[PDB]
């Protein structure tokens, strides 16, 4: 059965936080708000009043997925002798045991919490009490993305885009790190106007934040400027020395990057999107999360000035 019994929810929360958890708030809710991965969510007002959510792990799935997670590996083994894509097993076993431990997302969130603290377009909830298996956070609500992907206003959809692109730019000058691969139920929209981020599972760090050849690279192949685009592409890690590359290739492979700072406003639709080997780690990461928030623009339809916070965010951009 998917709700998992209050005794045994009493027992994750007696065995992570102690026998003495009850004393930490001012309600529990025994029966879960959601209840699927693994694990359930509760809802709960802590000792301040505060509205709490509270993520407790089912009592055997560590172990489970443990050697789950062996298995499959194996498997695609004898996969991989019958017909010569394994990323997936690594990129799950990645994914999947972040779930072991809440407390590396815990952490993630806390480096976010703190370098958007108090920031008047985004919002995220502080973490109250971590563990192994519980976590405890800031209740917040709003406006899901995926529900503003559905329905809501073109100008609703325009600020969830601008607000996840200046949030792309500027993780990695913040803090060094990056929000890393998500998908719109990380998001919401509060009735103020920031966006909320609650899910920081694939959180990326990037120490130094963006080198200064992407906006280098990227300014460079809009201003047609190759006999400068094609070294600071090679200093990039775009290219390798020596390398037979055509034009085209070059611009079929930075189009996806240079059309949105084409113009003062870009409007991200999915027609628009219908259309690594050895790289340096800190230019492999941010095209990713680029890709990923580029995706969702998409879906979102959104049209935002990636032009100006480019300009303003990303090192190197912006005219010498």
């Not at 709960?44 to 050697?67: C, F």
């Not at 080198?211 to 280098?216: D, F, M, N, V």
Request: glycine share 6%; proline share 7%; with cysteine.
């Amino acid at each position: 059965a998917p709700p998992l019994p209050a005794a045994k929810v009493h027992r994750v929360l007696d065995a992570q936080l102690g026998t003495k958890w009850r004393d930490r708030f001012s309600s529990f809710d025994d029966k879960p708000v959601a209840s699927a991965s693994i694990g359930q969510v509760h809802k709960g007002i802590w000792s301040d009043g505060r509205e709490v959510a509270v993520k407790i792990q089912y009592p055997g799935a560590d172990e489970a997925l443990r050697a789950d997670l062996k298995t499959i590996q194996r498997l695609v083994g004898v996969f991989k002798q019958l017909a010569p894509i394994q990323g997936v097993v690594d990129e799950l076993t990645e994914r999947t045991e972040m779930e072991l431990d809440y407390r590396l997302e815990a952490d993630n969130q806390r480096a976010f919490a703190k370098a958007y603290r108090n920031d008047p377009h985004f919002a995220v909830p502080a973490i109250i009490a971590s563990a192994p298996k519980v976590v405890i956070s800031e209740w917040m609500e709003g406006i899901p993305m995926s529900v503003i992907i559905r329905e809501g206003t073109p100008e609703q959809r325009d600020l969830m885009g601008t607000r996840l692109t200046e949030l792309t730019f500027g993780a990695p000058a913040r803090l060094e790190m990056m929000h890393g691969d998500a998908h719109p139920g990380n998001f919401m929209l509060l009735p103020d106007g920031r966006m909320g981020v609650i899910d920081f599972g694939a959180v990326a760090p990037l120490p130094g934040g963006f080198p200064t050849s992407l906006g280098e690279t990227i300014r460079l192949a809009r201003d047609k400027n190759y006999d400068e685009l094609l070294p600071t592409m090679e200093r990039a890690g775009f290219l390798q020395k020596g390398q037979e590359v055509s034009i085209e290739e070059v611009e079929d492979m930075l189009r996806q990057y240079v059309d949105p700072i084409k113009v003062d406003v870009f409007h991200y639709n999915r027609k628009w999107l219908q259309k690594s080997l050895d790289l340096p780690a800190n230019l492999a990461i941010p095209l990713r999360v680029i890709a990923s928030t580029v995706a969702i623009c998409c879906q979102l339809d959104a049209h935002v000035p990636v032009k100006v916070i480019a300009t303003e965010l990303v090192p190197g951009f912006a005219e010498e």
